[PDB]
Design a protein around this ligand. Structure first.
Ligand code: BEF
Ligand code: BEF
Ligand SMILES: [Zn+2]
Ligand SMILES: [Zn+2]
Ligand SMILES: [Zn+2]
Lengths: 513, 513
């Protein structure tokens, strides 16, 4: 079927050359001479696009626009007029005009406007597929050759970008990236297993990790006299920052970067390392009060504010600061009300936990299994919360206050696929991406064995304790009810292990506009 | 602040007057001679917009665009070239260009695209605010007089339209419509309580209601030899339809309409009326084995496929039909996978329950309390579900199967606000918007008294039973721990009573494009 065009213009006869040209290109043009005729035509038909002229007898062009957008809000309306007035242009833009063309009109301009407003989705789709197939060989070739951390960053940023651009494409085109994604995870998995021990041993030569975050990305700005809001959104992947960055460009300049999470990828160690500036083991030694062991019943991140103080004082700084933790809407509302009473501190730290709460609810919540069945839904559901929670307005006010913002997280999360059999003490931790214990049977290769936790800067309730970690998208399953739990945990989001999603996380330094 | 423009063209010299015109109108313009110089400037500067000439030395104009979008995807780009080729248009469109202007370009045309690509949201907001006040007058006029059912449809449609249209505006602009909506609900409740008993007694004259839906909206299509998918999304408000119809306009054209759900606005009564074509009392009188009374705890809508068979038979029809109920996520994926097999039926009934489950979860799920805290969030969450669940690809597949779709619901829901004291019994039901009881104590002025359930086509277990319904945003609250349950149920979504959201519900007839 060919596309239909409704063209309303009292001088429609002067446009015969254009109309023949359009009919020549396969379009079915319907002419009328008044806006009343135009509205009636829209009432009784389903045109694909409407060309309107501003100056007509009787009803005006912009009035027909308003009435037409009430009847067919999804049908693009192009305004084609002699007038160059600024109030006419403005009103048309406000009337939701799809495009505005000033007479005299190049016939080829009409052609462009018809392609862009009737086929931009189908066109963008075929280009994206083409441009992806173009870059496919480079991707596999880019990762094939062993590469540096800085290159690993760009490789992942690239895969994320493609993962988002291909949400709309067909399965076949989706799977080509999944393979590349998981193959990258496999290759990234072994990449960290080779160097993780030496990053702990050699802090000078290592990449930025959780204990260095405040030192590399926060202290420079504070020392430079800049006022900062450090926003920690627990469990915020790279692709979740891509999903929300468009909302924030309206208020901020982005200085995007990434850093490496320590293992395990969970708040107990990675987030405590961030605010303390130390590895968990050094937290237990130097500050035994502030560390909470794994076997304890109490929460494991209740002493982040005092840790911040030790970090500030340990570096001989005298920053004024504040700490707020929003784990419940109503608390985040009160914070949004008193936000501007924090204008005195050089550093305001806000922790948001809903995304981690939601990521976990993907397992034990019927609601979130549906609303985040897949990663695209997960990202969309993340966008909805960012917008309609206090978070959006929170950023808006901070931008008004002139505070720079370092937006980052403590770890990501990954959709788990394959079970890894493990058996341990009943008192063994219940995390599915890492386990702590002594009497643990498993296959050493299938996991990432750490028999000397002190070397990787991790404390232990005993001193025969060993750490094991899943890699890629694996997850631990116990032989009891193995058939059941593997069903229950397949395709859920789990953090604590090793993967590009979990470890490679964004740290965005944002300047208000 | 004045907006920054980056213009890249090898013949920049010639475009100088265009630049003075832009710079005259308060636009900072930065000119480069090639993409390479353009690609640099974007990294080293935060530009508001880019102007890309296609044909330049070395770097391809389109290949620069591809880079700029990957660096600063949030920044619009306008292409201004002498090219009139089709693929350059196509490639530029596929590169996510904002506007494409053929040389020679009118200066006012460059002004047009600058207003339309850097301010559009602000202009639309002002126009929306202005236009609503002008229409606010008429709406007040429409409500002033006595209203027919058809006028109630049109009024409610326009309230919802402005409800969504004003999501992007100040609070006070939202409180004007809120007052308008509340007044509309008050009159509509008055309108229902005056005429409801007449409607059940005069089928030939009453407006379309639940037991009439199939004969009025489905059978005429099948009689005309059309293939119909009847999709009932439980608990789907007008504003929820309004939120998704953009997604569907890509594949269907719509004949939008609304009908009245019978009371109570609950699946047990309204939805069974739909599929049986009878009032609940008639379902019990004629098909007692298919009716499930209130006392029992078994599901109340488990015999809808038999009811459809009796409806087809009752009207001496010979339709081939299927019936599928989706509440699990996995089952929906199975249905989509096998959607083609339903091509052997004239009528395909699909029931989707998630939106109702989701709506109820707004009460007892701290997840949905956050994700659907307000009506705007409720709509945003319905949109993401529709898109990223199997529902989107279900309508997609149905259109490709040349099937006509009748999308509707059994009732809406309303955010409750004010309690209405009621004394009942352990036997009394738990619905917040209506009660059934032999001995109910309440203030008759705060409810709609049905002492004669049979007169409104309702069954009951005891001869002295009666029905009472809340109106507007009221909800029933029992005296014991009244204070706790008032604050607990306040601001939740509840259905079963009288309101525009609950009763005046959409029925869309859709034709595949
Ligand atoms: F008469 Be139209 F506005 F060119
Ligand atoms: F040289 Be450009 F493509 F006008
Ligand atoms: Zn965390
Ligand atoms: Zn977590
Ligand atoms: Zn229902």
């Amino acid at each position: 079927r060919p596309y239909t065009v409704l063209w309303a213009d009292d001088e429609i006869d002067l446009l015969k050359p254009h109309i023949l040209f359009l009919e020549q290109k396969g379009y079915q043009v319907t002419p009328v001479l008044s806006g009343n005729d135009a509205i009636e035509a829209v009432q009784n038909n389903d045109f694909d696009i409407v060309f309107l002229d501003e100056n007509m007898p009787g009803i005006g062009g912009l009035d027909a626009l308003q009435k037409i957008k009430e009847l067919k809000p999804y049908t693009p309306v192009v305004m084609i007029t002699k007038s160059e007035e600024e109030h006419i242009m403005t009103q048309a833009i406000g009337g939701k005009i799809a495009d505005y063309l000033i007479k005299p009109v190049n016939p080829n301009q009409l052609l462009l406007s018809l392609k862009k407003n009737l086929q931009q989705h189908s066109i963008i789709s075929e280009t994206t597929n083409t441009n992806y197939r173009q870059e496919f060989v480079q991707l596999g070739t880019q990762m094939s050759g062993k590469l540096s951390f800085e290159e690993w960053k760009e490789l992942y940023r690239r895969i994320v970008f493609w993962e988002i651009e291909l949400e709309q494409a067909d399965r076949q085109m989706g799977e080509l990236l999944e393979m590349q994604k998981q193959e990258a995870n496999r290759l990234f998995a072994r990449f960290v297993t080779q160097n993780y021990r030496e990053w702990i041993a050699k802090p000078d030569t290592r990449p930025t990790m959780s204990p260095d975050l405040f030192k590399q990305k926060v202290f420079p700005l504070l020392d430079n006299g800049e006022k900062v809001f450090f926003i920690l959104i627990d469990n915020f992947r790279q692709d979740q920052w891509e999903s929300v960055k468009s909302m924030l460009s309206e208020f901020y300049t982005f200085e995007e970067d990434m850093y490496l999470s320590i293992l395990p990828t969970a708040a107990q160690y990675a987030r405590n390392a961030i605010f303390s500036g130390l590895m968990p083991l050094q937290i237990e030694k130097m500050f035994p009060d502030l560390w909470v062991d794994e076997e304890s019943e109490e929460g494991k991140n209740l002493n982040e504010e005092p840790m911040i103080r030790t970090l500030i004082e340990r570096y001989r700084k005298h920053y004024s600061f504040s700490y707020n933790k929003v784990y419940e809407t109503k608390f985040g509302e009160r914070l949004l009300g008193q936000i501007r009473s924090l204008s005195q501190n050089q550093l305001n730290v806000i922790v948001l936990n809903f995304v981690d709460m939601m990521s976990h609810a993907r397992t034990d919540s019927k609601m979130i299994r549906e609303l985040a069945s897949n990663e695209a839904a997960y990202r969309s559901l993340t966008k909805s919360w960012f917008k309609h929670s206090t978070t959006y307005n929170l950023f808006r006010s901070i931008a008004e206050m002139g505070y720079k913002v370092v937006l980052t997280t403590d770890h990501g999360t990954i959709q788990v696929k394959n079970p890894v059999k493990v058996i341990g003490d009943r008192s063994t931790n219940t995390n599915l991406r890492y386990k702590i214990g002594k009497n643990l049977d498993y296959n050493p290769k299938e996991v990432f064995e750490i028999k000397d936790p002190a070397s990787v800067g991790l404390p232990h309730n005993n001193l025969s304790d060993k750490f094991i970690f899943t890699k890629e998208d694996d997850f631990f399953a116990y032989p009891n009810n193995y058939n059941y739990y593997v069903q229950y945990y397949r395709n859920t989001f789990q953090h604590g292990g090793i993967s590009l999603e979990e470890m490679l996380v964004p740290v965005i330094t944002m300047q208000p506009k």
